């Protein structure tokens, strides 16, 4: 999920782009 | 994990910026 | 609209602290 | 939605959870 993968490293905007609708 | 929940917090303040007026669904573990 | 972004800013800390493990939904209009 | 019912008057927290998961 985004807190396994953004709270161990730094997610970028891009990245969390992935998790919008 | 006091921690994590801070981290989530920033998490769906990051996630209301790009996305926009698409939106998007907060589903954490 | 700035002053709905701004209150859609707060909306989406709201939801993360009452829905907590449930996660939440937010979609503009 | 969210924005119309909560941005135009004050959300208690039972009415946010209509929007939870
Ligand atoms: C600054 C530290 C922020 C907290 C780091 C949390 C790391 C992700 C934990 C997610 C919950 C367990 C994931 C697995 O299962
Ligand atoms: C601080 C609040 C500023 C005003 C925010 C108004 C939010 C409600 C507008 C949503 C769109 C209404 C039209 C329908 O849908
Ligand atoms: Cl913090
Ligand atoms: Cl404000
Ligand atoms: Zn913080
Ligand atoms: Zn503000």
Redesign the interface.
């Known amino acids: 999920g985004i807190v396994e993968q953004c709270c161990t490293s730094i997610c970028s905007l891009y990245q969390l782009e992935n998790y919008c609708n | 994990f006091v921690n ?1 929940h801070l ?3 920033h ?19």
């Open positions: 994590q981290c989530g917090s998490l769906v303040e990051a996630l209301y910026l790009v996305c926009g007026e698409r939106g998007f669904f907060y589903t954490p573990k």
